[PDB]
Amino acid sequence: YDRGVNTFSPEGRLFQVEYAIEAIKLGSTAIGIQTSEGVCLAVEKRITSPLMEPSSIEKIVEIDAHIGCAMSGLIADAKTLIDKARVETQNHWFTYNETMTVESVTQAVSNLALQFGEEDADPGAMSRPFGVALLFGGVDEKGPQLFHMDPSGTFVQCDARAIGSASEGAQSSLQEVYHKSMTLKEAIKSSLIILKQVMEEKLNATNIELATVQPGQNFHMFTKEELEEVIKDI
Amino acid sequence: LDKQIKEIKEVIELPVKHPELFEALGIAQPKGVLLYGPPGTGKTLLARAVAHHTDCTFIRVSGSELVQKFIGEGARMVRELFVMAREHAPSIIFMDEIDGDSEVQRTMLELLNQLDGFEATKNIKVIMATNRIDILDSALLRPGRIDRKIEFPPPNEEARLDILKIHSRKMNLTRGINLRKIAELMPGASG
Amino acid sequence: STYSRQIKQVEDDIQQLLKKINELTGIKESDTGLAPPALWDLAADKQTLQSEQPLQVARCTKIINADSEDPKYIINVKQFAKFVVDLSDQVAPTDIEEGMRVGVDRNKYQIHIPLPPKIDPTVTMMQVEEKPDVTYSDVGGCKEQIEKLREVVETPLLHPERFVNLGIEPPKGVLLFGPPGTGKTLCARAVANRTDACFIRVIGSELVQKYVGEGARMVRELFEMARTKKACLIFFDEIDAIGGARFDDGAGGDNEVQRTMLELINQLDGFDPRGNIKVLMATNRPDTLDPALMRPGRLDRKIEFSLPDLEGRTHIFKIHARSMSVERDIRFELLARLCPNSTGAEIRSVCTEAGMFAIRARRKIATEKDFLEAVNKVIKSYAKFSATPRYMTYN
Amino acid sequence: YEPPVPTRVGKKKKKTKGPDAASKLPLVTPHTQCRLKLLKLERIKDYLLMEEEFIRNQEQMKPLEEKQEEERSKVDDLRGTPMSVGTLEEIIDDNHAIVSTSVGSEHYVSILSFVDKDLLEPGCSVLLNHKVHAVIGVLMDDTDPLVTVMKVEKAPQETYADIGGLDNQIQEIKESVELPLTHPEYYEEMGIKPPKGVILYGPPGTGKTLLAKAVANQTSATFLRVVGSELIQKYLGDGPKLVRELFRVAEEHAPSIVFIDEIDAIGTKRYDSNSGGEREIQRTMLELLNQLDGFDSRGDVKVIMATNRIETLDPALIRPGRIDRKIEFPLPDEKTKKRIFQIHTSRMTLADDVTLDDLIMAKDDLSGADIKAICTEAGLMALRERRMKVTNEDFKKSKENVLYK
Numbered sequence A: 001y002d003r004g005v006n007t008f009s010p011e012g013r014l015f016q017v018e019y020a021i022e023a024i025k026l027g028s029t030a031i032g033i034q035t036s037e038g039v040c041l042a043v044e045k046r047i048t049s050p051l052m053e054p055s056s057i058e059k060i061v062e063i064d065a066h067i068g069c070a071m072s073g074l075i076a077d078a079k080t081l082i083d084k085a086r087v088e089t090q091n092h093w094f095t096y097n098e099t100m101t102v103e104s105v106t107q108a109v110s111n112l113a114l115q116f117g118e119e120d121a122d123p124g125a126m127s128r129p130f131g132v133a134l135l136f137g138g139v140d141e142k143g144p145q146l147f148h149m150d151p152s153g154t155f156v157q158c159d160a161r162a163i164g165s166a167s168e169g170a171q172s173s174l175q176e177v178y179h180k181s182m183t184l185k186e187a188i189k190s191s192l193i194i195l196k197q198v199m200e201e202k203l204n205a206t207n208i209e210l211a212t213v214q215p216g217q218n219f220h221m222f223t224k225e226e227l228e229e230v231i232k233d234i
Numbered sequence B: 001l002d003k004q005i006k007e008i009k010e011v012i013e014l015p016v017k018h019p020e021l022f023e024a025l026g027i028a029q030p031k032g033v034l035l036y037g038p039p040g041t042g043k044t045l046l047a048r049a050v051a052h053h054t055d056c057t058f059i060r061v062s063g064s065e066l067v068q069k070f071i072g073e074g075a076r077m078v079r080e081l082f083v084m085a086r087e088h089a090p091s092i093i094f095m096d097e098i099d100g101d102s103e104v105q106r107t108m109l110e111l112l113n114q115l116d117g118f119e120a121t122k123n124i125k126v127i128m129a130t131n132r133i134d135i136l137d138s139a140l141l142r143p144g145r146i147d148r149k150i151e152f153p154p155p156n157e158e159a160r161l162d163i164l165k166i167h168s169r170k171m172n173l174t175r176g177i178n179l180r181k182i183a184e185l186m187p188g189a190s191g
Numbered sequence C: 001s002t003y004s005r006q007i008k009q010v011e012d013d014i015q016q017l018l019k020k021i022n023e024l025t026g027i028k029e030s031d032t033g034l035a036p037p038a039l040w041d042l043a044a045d046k047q048t049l050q051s052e053q054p055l056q057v058a059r060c061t062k063i064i065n066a067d068s069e070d071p072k073y074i075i076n077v078k079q080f081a082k083f084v085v086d087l088s089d090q091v092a093p094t095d096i097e098e099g100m101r102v103g104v105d106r107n108k109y110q111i112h113i114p115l116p117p118k119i120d121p122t123v124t125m126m127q128v129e130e131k132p133d134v135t136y137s138d139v140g141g142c143k144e145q146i147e148k149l150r151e152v153v154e155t156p157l158l159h160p161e162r163f164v165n166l167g168i169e170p171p172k173g174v175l176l177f178g179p180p181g182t183g184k185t186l187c188a189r190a191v192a193n194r195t196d197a198c199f200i201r202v203i204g205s206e207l208v209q210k211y212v213g214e215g216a217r218m219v220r221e222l223f224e225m226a227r228t229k230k231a232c233l234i235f236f237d238e239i240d241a242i243g244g245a246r247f248d249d250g251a252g253g254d255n256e257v258q259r260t261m262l263e264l265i266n267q268l269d270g271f272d273p274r275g276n277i278k279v280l281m282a283t284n285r286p287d288t289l290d291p292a293l294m295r296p297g298r299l300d301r302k303i304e305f306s307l308p309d310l311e312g313r314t315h316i317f318k319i320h321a322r323s324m325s326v327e328r329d330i331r332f333e334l335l336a337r338l339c340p341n342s343t344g345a346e347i348r349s350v351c352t353e354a355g356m357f358a359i360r361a362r363r364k365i366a367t368e369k370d371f372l373e374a375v376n377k378v379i380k381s382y383a384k385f386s387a388t389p390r391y392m393t394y395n
Numbered sequence D: 001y002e003p004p005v006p007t008r009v010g011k012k013k014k015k016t017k018g019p020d021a022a023s024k025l026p027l028v029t030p031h032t033q034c035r036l037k038l039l040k041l042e043r044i045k046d047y048l049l050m051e052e053e054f055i056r057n058q059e060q061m062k063p064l065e066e067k068q069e070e071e072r073s074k075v076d077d078l079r080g081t082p083m084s085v086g087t088l089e090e091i092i093d094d095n096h097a098i099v100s101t102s103v104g105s106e107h108y109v110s111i112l113s114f115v116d117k118d119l120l121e122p123g124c125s126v127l128l129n130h131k132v133h134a135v136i137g138v139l140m141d142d143t144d145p146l147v148t149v150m151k152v153e154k155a156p157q158e159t160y161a162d163i164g165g166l167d168n169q170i171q172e173i174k175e176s177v178e179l180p181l182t183h184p185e186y187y188e189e190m191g192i193k194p195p196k197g198v199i200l201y202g203p204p205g206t207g208k209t210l211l212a213k214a215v216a217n218q219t220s221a222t223f224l225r226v227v228g229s230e231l232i233q234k235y236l237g238d239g240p241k242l243v244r245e246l247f248r249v250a251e252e253h254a255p256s257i258v259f260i261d262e263i264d265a266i267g268t269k270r271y272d273s274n275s276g277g278e279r280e281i282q283r284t285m286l287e288l289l290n291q292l293d294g295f296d297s298r299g300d301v302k303v304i305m306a307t308n309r310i311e312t313l314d315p316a317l318i319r320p321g322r323i324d325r326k327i328e329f330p331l332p333d334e335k336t337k338k339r340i341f342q343i344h345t346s347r348m349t350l351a352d353d354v355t356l357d358d359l360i361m362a363k364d365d366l367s368g369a370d371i372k373a374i375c376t377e378a379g380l381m382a383l384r385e386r387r388m389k390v391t392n393e394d395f396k397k398s399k400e401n402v403l404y405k
């Protein structure tokens, strides 16, 4: 239309940024919880047909051996951010022989957001914001850490953050059930409980993804047996 | 225009005089006719002749406001003329496009839409005359709207001779006029 | 079947009896506007025809020698004539003013009765006489919007004593704006249902007239007849029909409509006080409105009917599925989550289409699957024709 | 001096029109020929007997001046002759009104008792005494020529059986314009009002107007047909006025179906006779928006719209609440093409060498209108050769006639 991508509303809102933020509410619900025992990431696969293979719906991604990411919204848009996170990481290791801070990874991914434009831009520059919301979860010198990133490039550490279609109700439930000193098993169970009450379908070990980043241990995607072990309770 | 006379006859004379032919054929009687050709080729002449010979009332719809008081005090829709046409059935509604969008073709679209399946009284035919057929709206060129399109090409040498014979018959002519030579002297002429 | 013969006998007797009754009493004609004979006061009609003389309507023009005991009144009897007359003995001299319509006799044309000002019948019909069947309980997700609207258009009329005591002048204008189907006209209908003062509904397209200056005349007469009431509300639905911003495009582009809008603006806030009229306008294109019309003192409150949030959508789903024969475990919160940016009209259509899916399957109860298919058909399948994405740039 | 105060609330006439009047006998249930219906009918009969005896007695001892025929004659004398036709300009009081005669002169006259005072509204045509101009009646306005223009007097002969392949479309339109009238109990028991509006969209010739004709054939409601281009008027505000009057007429004949055919033609076509340009068309569209879903309460009026260009319509016009259902009419597939060919050749006398399978693929983008035109033109070719049996050569010439050139 007449408006450019880099246009400000009379209220001071970047139009395309707000419109990309509205894209997350159509995405699947993801829930990240940070606890002293580790970071738990959960997401709903939202299977639309029995023929579709659930294993191909990858919405929790290994960023590095100590960092994972859960994406919500336009999953295709999240591929570029994931690739930049996984390339920017191992570049810090290449030059400094150390793993990045989760905050540094989230900041590097955030710098990609808002790097879009129409005129006076590079040929490889993007045309629109990334219509995806990311939940980075990892372990670093500061222990376990969970960061939330949105298409405006605003990344912020969160104790327990829910994004996606059910972000409002899941966030309310997280506020109701989160306390700072709780185990990782309790975090996983609470996240699964919150997911189960917001899914359109019925929760099972196939339509959800669960991952954990614990101190000492590496990023771990939960298998079907491990998922069934915790689902059998609730 | 013998071919044009036969073509317009099979579509306007037969449905009025012999609806049983179309009923036996199992086809819908034609309701809309298009006559396309250069101006002065006899489209209005043939329309008036076919209205005269079949005893069908000839109504010319020019869209002029001067005659609106006769059509109706409302004048909000052109279909208000139908009340008059039904009172003089069989009727032939004629509109000539002199050539925004064309009002004559819009009136065609409205009248044809009414005549499609929403008109109770039969024997109400509708004729257009237009200079060109490639300018017509896609709605009018859609199959099923105009049941027959008849071309009125400019007369050739023999047709020009026939028109010359018809029109010079109204004059005190000396014997021995070589009307054939005069017809040859008018290449690309209209009636 | 054993009673059928007696049924028909007594039915025919009843029909004959009804015809016989109508023979003596009346009930006939009805094409010449004749009332039933039970209301015929014929003696009083004759006494009125004799005693009560007809009065021609004229307009007083000038009062000569009003101070003295012989004031002469120049009246303009419509298309008839112009006369210099005097008041009848039964009319006080102070009851007739210059420029007001009067009624005079046909013999000496002496002024016999002051008359109400002439109002166009089209303007008169614009006032609402049957209140709509919508209450504020039928609008969901608009708690703040409804409160702001009520404290301007309803509270000052209901309890004016709370405002005069504190020297408070309440706002006298509200503009409801938002994407189509968000509930602007629904809230206006709720206001008209709850209001007790005179409510006038004006559609902007009704203010477009064939002739020059006629729309401004209708606006003037609308505010004249609105001022003949102690408290009044005027609703301007789709004010963008005539409320567009003034522009000069070389030719006379929208000059007459701009004059109508200027007349409306002058009535709202001009040299003369507006009165106790509290106006109300609803439009889905508030960006096109003139800056002078969008100014406080003409449109003091600007209530935005944005698309409902999750709680608002759940509330609308509860409102529209209240009388539904739904199942026991319908997850209306999930349904509201499944349509992020949807108007209340889309939610109503979702409820109706879920009911239609249940009906088509010859089922008396609509399950949750029916609501899911309704969401797919309305929110998703019909999303090509959605007016939402285009119209939130305008709001 | 004080102004008179009317006792009637409002200034408009009574909404109810054309009722049973004094013949509104109580609805007796059950309709079955049982003794309880018999007893209810007898009770009505006894009340009518008592009424008849009472009225006969009262008229018997009423004075010779006060008799039904005598009072009617006195009413005629009070009205006099001729009875002028004026316009009710204003209702000053219950028995006083300002009325304007045909010469443009207004009069403050008295409304007599025998006038049907609930028929009086501003602008209504009243009958006045010739001498004193007192209101002596209300003239029942004759049907407007435009009212005749919209109303479809005779139902079209095209039925649902004459439509091939549009099963889902027929079901969707029946659920909105036919089932709510024939079987309202479904909607009442389900707790939902029927789908408000329906728009039929698709490529030209797909059968939108044919489905509207089929609906008009099997409908008990008044059918009003308006073409979109008919809403474009020559004067400012006349378009909105026409839309307003169309929906007023729809409200008068409730239940009714309003078929706004070729709605997109209001915007896709520009005529110089339209004084206002695109802005007057926009005002007409806003009036249509108000009529479809606006402030005024809508009765039993169903709206059907058809267009081959739905992308050019204002999205606020077809928003839910205004048009609930958007029924698509795709180009026919092979099964539907065969059904259409069999439908339009059912009354035909085909030859043994004519096969519809070959004609099924005359063109890739073949529609129902193209097939019907093929059949009609083939019959015309058979008529040219004075034949009743249509040959394959006739259909071959038909294809090159309608589809090409």
Ligand SMILES: Nc1ncnc2c1ncn2[C@@H]1O[C@H](COP(=O)(O)OP(=O)(O)OP(=O)(O)O)[C@@H](O)[C@H]1O
Binding pocket: C138, C139, C140, C141, C142, C178, C179, C180, C181, C182, C183, C184, C185, C186, C187, C282, C283, C284, C316, C319, C343, C344, C345, C346, C348, D289, D293, D294, D316, D319, D321
């Ligand atoms: N907040 C709401 N709560 C409940 N129902 C609603 C709400 N908003 C809209 N609806 C429903 O959707 C319908 C939309 O019609 P409405 O008159 O409210 O639209 P609008 O906002 O005036 O639209 P437009 O701008 O096209 O005139 C209403 O009649 C009502 O049934």
Ligand SMILES: Nc1ncnc2c1ncn2[C@@H]1O[C@H](COP(=O)(O)OP(=O)(O)OP(=O)(O)O)[C@@H](O)[C@H]1O
Binding pocket: B139, B142, B144, D162, D163, D164, D165, D166, D203, D204, D205, D206, D207, D208, D209, D210, D211, D306, D307, D308, D329, D332, D340, D343, D367, D368, D369, D370, D372
């Ligand atoms: N599916 C069909 N089955 C049977 N006949 C059909 C079908 N589709 C079209 N026809 C025939 O084609 C004729 C013309 O089609 P019709 O006018 O209904 O099309 P339309 O889609 O409304 O077109 P338009 O967009 O031009 O107004 C109909 O009178 C009917 O006889």
Ligand SMILES: Nc1ncnc2c1ncn2[C@@H]1O[C@H](COP(=O)(O)OP(=O)(O)O)[C@@H](O)[C@H]1O
Binding pocket: B001, B038, B039, B040, B041, B042, B043, B044, B045, B046, B096, B129, B155, B163, B166, B190, B191
């Ligand atoms: N083919 C023709 N034969 C005889 N006269 C003709 C012929 N074509 C045109 N004319 C004469 O030309 C005059 C005007 O032609 P008209 O039919 O109005 O042209 P158009 O077909 O463009 O309407 C008529 O009065 C008619 O006598």
Ligand SMILES: [Mg+2]
Binding pocket: B039, B040, B041, B043, B044, B096
């Ligand atoms: Mg010509």
Ligand SMILES: [Mg+2]
Binding pocket: C184, C185, C186, C237, C282, D293, D294
């Ligand atoms: Mg509205």
Ligand SMILES: [Mg+2]
Binding pocket: D208, D209, D261, D262, D306
């Ligand atoms: Mg059509």
